[PDB]
Assembly symmetry: C3
Homo-oligomer: 113 residues x 3
């Protein structure tokens, strides 16, 4: 499912039994200015479960501080690094440190109507 590309990568974890998906962590330091966005690297290479797709989903605590998720639809049987688009829609600079929890990866089945 998940492979570490570097020793900076942290394995995606589940916060709770009833967690919708997997916690994602930044592998690098970032500084996002207000009204700007940054693609954050996890350094986790992922293999999409067959007949499923992924959605990068917001942390509530970050959303309360103005930080939103851009994009995050992971499909087409994607194999590669997990990137997270953090959008700073707050008034102040937002700092990301290596190892910070940044988002959740939620799996759902592809529906074929």
């Amino acid at each position: 499912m998940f492979v570490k590309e570097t020793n900076r990568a942290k394995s995606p974890t589940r916060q709770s039994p009833g967690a919708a998906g997997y916690d994602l962590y930044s592998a690098y330091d970032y500084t996002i200015p207000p009204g700007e966005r940054q693609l954050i690297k996890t350094d986790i290479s992922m293999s999409m479960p067959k007949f499923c797709y992924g959605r990068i989903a917001p942390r509530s605590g970050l959303s309360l501080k103005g930080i939103d998720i851009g994009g995050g639809v992971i499909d087409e049987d994607y194999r590669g690094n997990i990137g997270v688009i953090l959008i700073n829609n707050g008034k102040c600079t937002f700092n990301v440190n290596t190892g910070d929890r940044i988002a959740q990866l939620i799996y759902q089945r592809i529906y074929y109507p």
Copy 2:
């Protein structure tokens, strides 16, 4: 499923049998400035259905007015008041009155691959 914590709370409703989820209503009054966000309280405590999570989803009419949803991933078998992060990305202030329909809560089952 839904417990009104105060007399200001309104029971979440499915308006049509084809609705994805349950209409949520503000339990309080708010005035959201342009470029700002606010956690809107519903005063509704929810019991999560087993192996499910909830997503706060936008009203289309509000999205056309520049109002978006922040956060809104309700998981971890969450027990407590439903809050909706309303983001005003319009040019003018957005008024939220008690009783206003603010969002929809959509349930999905958790997929643990």
Copy 3:
């Protein structure tokens, strides 16, 4: 599933075999100034598959350029044209040409608790 209302409409495509949903295309020319949003017409009418709802989901390519999705919850047995709210949170004017891929429509079955 999909019906063209005009000669300008382009039929939604499932890209890869592991695509989450169907690519949507603009039927018209649009100019979106920074900090503004626009409802983009596809001129494609849809009939909702039984016990399902739709979600307009972002293209990663546009999200990385600062283009986000507003609204996009298609429920309540929806019959009619598909429109996509594109939000220009970039710093320059965003151009939408006829035939441009603008988003994806992702179907999910409604969970009834």
